[PDB]
Amino acid sequence: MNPPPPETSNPNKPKRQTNQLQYLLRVVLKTLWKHQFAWPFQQPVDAVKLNLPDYYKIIKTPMDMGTIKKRLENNYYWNAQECIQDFNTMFTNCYIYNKPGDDIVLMAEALEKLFLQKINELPT
């Protein structure tokens, strides 16, 4: 089985919209989305389809840009740092499950550098 995907809404959790969260969606996520290396990260890891049956035996806090996009569109986050933490979880998961120099890791590392450049300055 794949596990249930991470939540993209939670009525118990307070919502917020900030200039910085708007920028993470309009500029950061939407630019990374178009990168040629973004496709493995645009949805939860489908362990069944991809025949990685040990993925969720290893990765206990999964995250992906499809989930982040939905969360941003939902105003699920309280602040930009919560969203940035999801991006970092997504990258770290890929480095945990895979090995240095792997093709998928080279893709994550290219996205991560672009992500870091984009968040170097956020709006006020």
Ligand X SMILES: O=C1CCCN1Cc1cc(Cl)c2cccnc2c1O
Nearer to ligand X, 77 or 97 (CB): 97
The least distance separating ligand X from the CB of residue 73, rounded to whole angstroms, comes to 21
Distance, in Å, from the CA atom of 67 to the CA atom of 62, rounded to the nearest integer, reads 10
Which stretch in 10-18, 38-46, 74-82, 114-122 sits in contact with ligand X by CB under 6 A? 38-46
Nearer to ligand X, 104 or 110 (CB): 104
As a whole number of angstroms, the distance between CA 71 and CA 59 comes to 20
Count CB atoms within 10 A of the CB of residue 60: 9
Among 25, 45, 80, 84, binds ligand X (CB under 6 A): 45
92 binds ligand X (CB under 6 A): no
Task: Give residues in contact with ligand X (CB under 6 A).
Answer: 40-41, 45, 50, 52, 94, 97-98, 104
